[PDB]
Structure formats: structure tokens, C-alpha cells
Design a protein around this ligand. Structure first.
Ligand SMILES: [Ca+2]
Ligand SMILES: [Ca+2]
Ligand SMILES: [Ca+2]
Ligand SMILES: [Ca+2]
Ligand SMILES: [Ca+2]
Ligand SMILES: [Ca+2]
Ligand SMILES: [Ca+2]
Ligand SMILES: [Ca+2]
Ligand SMILES: [Ca+2]
Ligand SMILES: [Ca+2]
Ligand SMILES: [Ca+2]
Ligand SMILES: [Ca+2]
Ligand SMILES: [Ca+2]
Ligand SMILES: [Ca+2]
Ligand SMILES: [Ca+2]
Ligand SMILES: [Ca+2]
Ligand SMILES: [Ca+2]
Ligand SMILES: [Ca+2]
Lengths: 160, 160, 160, 160, 160, 160
């Protein structure tokens, strides 16, 4: 079963948008969001990836309790939120903690309630509403198969 | 200068939507929001009011630090967020703490930055997005004069 | 479908054990727990009940986010944690928010994962470990039918 | 052994100064402090007292973990912080939770480390530094005997 | 007087169990605990040690306020919680902040109240209760002399 | 316009005083403050500086919401709190987030309310009150021009 390490940048509940300077590994404040929204899940990026936009591949991790920024979490993917913004493709792999039997009932995109999925989508559809020149479109939930393929691809680009 | 007591129901930052049962004064959980949004300001209602929809008149209070639900805050109005939802008129009086010289620079709607005002509006425009049969429209910022008039009116209805 | 109001005394995560003086409705600190444990769910009591031990019937409410002490939550039962302590029967009705379609998949005790149920049980089996003269035994999960019956019974005693 | 109920208005750590309207029992925001200071202990007032300034007698309660505003705590006194401000005498009874054997080693003012006592004093000496027309003087730690006497006195005035 | 640096992995109050990948120094989520328990003290490991189980020697640090994961704290030992789990010896050195006169009254294991010591023990006796194949036994508090000896030993193994 | 990276060591609200070991970049607990005070702003140091006391130049960053320790924030200076302590000059550059139009109204020291400036000063005047052999004097607010000059100077010393 595929699994990888996600470095969580942003705990669920946060309106501060944290980033990593990937050359140093330092945590940075990108910005305080302009909309009254909060990250709907712990959010970060998969280590050792280069995604379809030449940046590390982003990840959403479902957790019973948020972690802190900078924290590593072994995760396995269950689907992906495909999406395009002002800078191109900017997909978000949906994950759950790997090796944790409490999440064994969550295997594919159909195992996550439509309420959570809609909430996550709503966040990404709207979080940049009040930033001029930023938008998101082509918002679309896809399944684990497509998540794994995109992870695989992005692991190769990182090595190549 | 007009001033009144706001009972804060919801601290800034909250996705739990709290209410008061007005016959008992008890704090109640209305619902956890369906959108990944958080109240942009401390939010409650003005004591001893009956607003244009037969419910107590709602208030937003700007604070350097949030309070807890149930807490009273002496406030003075500086503008109002006019708005209509599925149940009619549902305006929100914008306030600052009364008698606090740190807020003396905030007198009318023009004294609050467009960033905060847009954020507040965005919240109310979108918080009910994923609740079917609920919407908001006629979103409009108005000045202190109109806030005071609507407060006055609603104080009378409460007595009448 | 049965539903009732729970007054939450203790948010999930708390080692402070809060109580209500039922004659006044005031929130009181019973004690800081002696064990390094935290309430596994929001915890309180059902309003207008007299349980099998002459005290109000206790409730556990599953929530996506904790509330504050004193808060009312409309809830419906899905099972019960039967249990006896030094002062007799001291059952805990397991609930979810009433009228919230996000919890519609949770109808009976079999709909709650064994992990959560074991965790809840573990808490009540051990929280009083270091208090001399206090114990719990006859720990047993039962279904909604038995929860409703015990609620019904306790509503009658409150009126009688 | 003397004991009484303290209604905690302010958790340790807070820069929001909460009050009670004693005619209604409602919690109110008095003000956000003007100095960058935080209450050094849970702070409130003893129920059913009228202190030497015609206001309820104030209490500091040592706790392993703070409570929320409005919460009642059975407490016993161990000393008092005598003090005078712009409105006269404004003493603060130092307490620990009554009936809790974890605090049995704390019986009189000499049982509380000089570090905590100095910190508490420092708070009250300085919290009003930037409020014009407010000051505190005659800051003085006294023992349990004097605390009990002042409590007793203030219980009588409340009845008389 | 012996002193050393502890890297705190887990603040007091946490049910998320954090770890360090010792080759990278990165903070990692080991798991969310399966029991409704919370770390009773700030918890981590002593830098530059190899303990009796070939892993870094673990430390509990008493603090007036928790730190964040990853934080270094100069500490001095006052006793040790000896203990064996499924993977062998897994002792926990009890410490207080070095060079802080507020902790000068705490010199040896007898200076820490039996309540805290019992609570700490209870945590480690039970935290793994619901993890199959994990247990702890030979739980035993020992004094500073034995703590220092075990630290010394583990400093040597790290160099050897 | 001048801008630089501040590594925030201490979030606003904290009584734990965090430090960086500048040779390793590790976050360390310096001490829990002895006074009941809390940092009035996010506090840290400007990367790649050597200030007038041979230590990195310290920075205060105004934020709508605090960050975590270790976090980098692109900032631009708007003034400086000049100050001398037991170890010499120990100035604090006042900053706001660089590239954030919400702070464009804050350009020089006159753009920050006297209330915030007095609060910040009060903190540094008093935070060491109960530490023997530590003091601060020559407390003085100066403008952006002088802040930039001192930053420039300290960037050179770091290279030289
Ligand atoms: Ca990113
Ligand atoms: Ca960016
Ligand atoms: Ca936009
Ligand atoms: Ca309302
Ligand atoms: Ca409603
Ligand atoms: Ca809708
Ligand atoms: Ca109870
Ligand atoms: Ca009790
Ligand atoms: Ca027991
Ligand atoms: Ca008072
Ligand atoms: Ca007052
Ligand atoms: Ca003054
Ligand atoms: Ca470890
Ligand atoms: Ca492990
Ligand atoms: Ca086990
Ligand atoms: Ca420093
Ligand atoms: Ca230092
Ligand atoms: Ca000093």
C-alpha cells in the first residue's frame, strides 16, 4: 500500500497560512488569510516530490487532533482534490495516517462523507476570494488511483 | 453618545455557532458551521431589542481579544451590515467597546478598514453556502446614523 | 425520534471536572482529576431528569468540536454506557446532535467505532483510580433501545 | 476550618478583565488591560460578602489548572493581599481549593513560595500603571488569621 | 551539579504522541493515543544519550507552563521512573529546569509530592492499555543518584 | 523599501521566554518570566544581523494573529524601541509584515497608537523587575529612519 511522509505546514483551524522555504526547511508565514476562513484539515506537502506545477505536491491529512507546523506524519492517500489556480495546477492529495487501524475504514474517496468533502472544496474555492489576481477553478474530487498516480509521477520528477 | 449592552454569543475564531434561548438566557449550540469559516468578530445581540424580524438585534463587536459566550460588553455602534436571509431582515450592528479611549478613533463606518469590512461581509455572504434553503442577499454596509436609528426602533418594539 | 437537551458540563479534553449545582444552575469545579486523563467526549446531563441514583441522568455527546461548560445541546441518544460506582448506578447516555444530518449515519451503538467506545469505557474505568473509596464496575455498553427506556423512566421520576 | 465559595471571574493568564454585575449575576467585560500583564492566578470574589469598600470581597485561588469565568470553587483562605486603590480598600484573599488533599501542605501565608507572592503583588502594583487616575498602594501580604477575620466581617455586613 | 539539555517532544496535556527522527532531528507524529489520557508532564529525551535500550534516554520535565515540541530545556534530574515495556527498559528521568531558583526546593525524589508521582506512574502504567502487544511493567520510582548514574552511563554509550 | 526576515521566538501572549541557540538554530526555553507579564507582540530577531551588543538584532512584529516559535516572517521596520539593560544596548526594531497591504497605513512610528507603544514600553520596563541584577533604562521610541540605520549597521557587522 502506498504511503509517504507529509510535512504538515498548517493545522486545521488556522487562518495563518504557513509555508516552507524548501531550500532551508524553515517554516515561514505566507500570509494571514484575507477571508474569514480556516484550513479545514491539517495541510502540508509530501516530502521529496515535484508536482505538476514544479512545486512540492500538497496534501490534506485527516486527523483526530491537529499537529503543529513542521511536523511529519506518515500518511497514505485516499483521493485527491484536483484544482487549478492563478499559477496552474495545484492539486491536493487527501490522506489519512498510515498504519493506524482507526482509519482502515477509509480506503477511497467514497469513504469520506460528502459533508467533509464539500467543506474542503468550499475552502479552496473561496479562501482567495479577496485576493485580486488569485482564483481557483476546475475544482474536482478524484479517487485514490488518480492520487497514487500523481504522487508516483511527482516522486519521479523529484529524482529526475 | 448611544451605547448599549451586547451579549456576546460567539467569540471571533469560532466555527461553533452559539445562540441564546431568550426566554431562559441559556447559551445553546445552534450548529457547527457547514462551511470552513470562522466568525470574523465577536458576535451577539443587543439586550432588550426586538429587530425588524421579530428577533433580537444582532451585533458585531470589534475587540483586541475575544471574550467567552454569555459575556456582556458595553458597546457603541459605528455602522451596520444590512442583510437579508431566508427568514427576512437580519442586520448586524457594528460596534466597538464603549468608554474605551483606544477605540475613540473609530466613530463611523469610514473609520474601519475596507479589509475588515470585506472580510466580515464575505463571512455572512458565504457561511450558509452549504446549508440548503439558506442564503443571504442585499448585503450592504451602512453608517452609524442608520445603525443608531435601527437600534432606537428596536428598543421601542421591545417595550411596545 | 427521541431527543432532549443536554447541558454540557465538561468539554472533551478536560481534566477539570465541572458540575452543576442543580438548585441554582451554577457551574462548579468538582475537582481536578487525580489521574492524567481527559474527558473523551463532551459530558453533561439531560435537563429535567432524575436517574436511577436520584441524580440527573448523565450524557456523553459526540461533537466535531467541543462546546463550553453550561452550554445546551439538543441531542438524540444512540446507546448507553451502563456503569456502577461507589454511589450506585451512574449510567451515561451516548448522544449525537439532534437534527444534524452529519450524524444521521449514527443511529445505534453499532454505528460508533469500537475504538471510541473502548476509549470512553477506559476513561470511566480508570479516571477514579487514585481516589480512595471510589471505583467503577459493571461497565457495559448497551443499545439505543435501552438508552431511550432509561431516559423515559428518568423523565417520569423528575415529574413524579 | 473556614471555607466558602469563590465565583471565579478571571482565569489565570488573562488580560481581559471580567466582572460580575452582582444584581443580575451576569459576567461582563470590564476592560482589556492597558498594561501587557496577565492575571497571575484565577481571580474572583467570595459569594455573599460585602467588603471594606462596600463591594464583594475579592479572592485569588491557586489552581493546578484554570477554570472558566462564572465558575464556582469551594475554597479556603491561606492569607490575604492587603491593598488600597483609587476607590479605597481592595483586599484580595488568597485561597486554595477546599477539601483537596493536594493543597493540605498550604495552610498559611508562609506555605506559599516568595516567588508566587512577589509575582502576585507585582501584578497588582502595576496592572493599572497606564490608567490615569488609578493607582495602588499599601501593598502588603498578611496571614490566614487576618484573612479569616476580614472574611467573617464581610459576611456579617452582607447580612446586615 | 549534573545538568543537560532535554529536547521536549510532548507538552503536558497532549494526547498526540510526538517523536523525533534522531537522524534528521525532525519532529514526527508517532500516534494519537488510544486511551483518553494526556501526558502528565512535558516529555522528551536528553540530547547525546544512548539509553539501556539503544534509544535516547527519555525525560520528564516539571514546568510552570508547557513548551512546544522541538524546544530545548536545560534541566537537572531529581529522580527517575524506571519501567519496562514490550521493547525492554524504557526509563524516564524526572527533571526540573536547571538554574532556576524557583525549583531549588526540588532536589531529590522525596521533594516531589506523591500525588504528582502517582499521576505520572498511572499515565505510563495505562497509556498503552488499548494497544495490543504493548504493556508496561516493573514501574518503580528511584532517586536522583540512580538517575544521574543512568544518565552518565548513557552519555558514555553515545560517545562509545 | 527595506525589508528582512524576522525569526519569531515568542508569540504575543507568552510568559515563556524562548531563545534561539544561534549556532544550531534550535529553539530553547530561556526562562518562564518572574513577573506576571506577557510579550505584547510577536518577538524575535532579524536573521543575519549582529547588533550593537554583539548579539542578533531583536524585532517586534505587529500581527493580526500570532505565529509559533521558529517561524520566519518577512517584515519591514517602522520604528525602534531603544533601550539598555544589564548587558548593554538591546534595541527592539518595530516591524509589520512586508508586502501586506493591510499594514500600508503603518509607515513610521507616528502611525502606531500611543496605547500600543506605551504597552510595549511598559513590558520592557518591567518584565525583569523581579530578577536581581537585571534592569532596563534609557527606554526610548525612535523613528523608522533610525531603525533602518541600525539594521543596516548590524547587517554589515554580521558580514564583517
Ligand atoms: Ca505550500
Ligand atoms: Ca507563496
Ligand atoms: Ca480573488
Ligand atoms: Ca442570534
Ligand atoms: Ca437557529
Ligand atoms: Ca445555502
Ligand atoms: Ca454530574
Ligand atoms: Ca461531586
Ligand atoms: Ca479508587
Ligand atoms: Ca471585582
Ligand atoms: Ca469596574
Ligand atoms: Ca495609573
Ligand atoms: Ca521517544
Ligand atoms: Ca515509535
Ligand atoms: Ca496493551
Ligand atoms: Ca533574543
Ligand atoms: Ca539568555
Ligand atoms: Ca531587576
Amino acid at each position: 500500500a502506498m504511503q509517504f511522509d507529509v510535512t504538515i505546514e498548517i493545522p486545521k483551524g488556522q487562518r495563518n497560512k504557513y509555508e516552507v522555504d524548501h531550500e532551508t526547511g524553515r517554516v515561514r508565514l505566507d500570509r494571514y488569510l484575507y477571508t474569514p476562513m480556516a484550513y479545514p484539515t491539517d495541510y502540508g506537502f509530501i516530502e521529496d516530490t515535484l508536482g505538476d506545477d514544479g512545486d512540492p505536491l500538497d496534501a490534506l491529512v485527516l486527523l483526530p487532533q491537529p499537529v503543529f507546523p513542521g511536523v511529519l506524519v506518515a500518511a497514505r492517500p485516499v483521493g485527491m482534490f484536483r484544482m487549478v489556480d492563478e499559477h496552474g495546477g495545484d492539486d491536493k492529495v487527501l490522506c489519512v495516517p498510515a498504519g493506524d487501524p482507526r482509519w482502515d475504514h477509509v480506503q477511497d474517496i467514497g469513504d469520506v462523507p460528502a459533508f467533509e468533502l464539500d467543506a474542503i472544496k468550499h475552502f479552496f474555492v473561496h479562501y482567495k476570494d479577496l485576493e485580486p489576481g488569485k482564483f481557483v477553478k476546475a475544482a474536482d474530487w478524484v479517487d485514490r488511483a488518480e492520487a497514487e498516480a500523481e504522487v508516483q509521477r511527482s516522486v519521479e520528477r523529484f529524482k529526475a
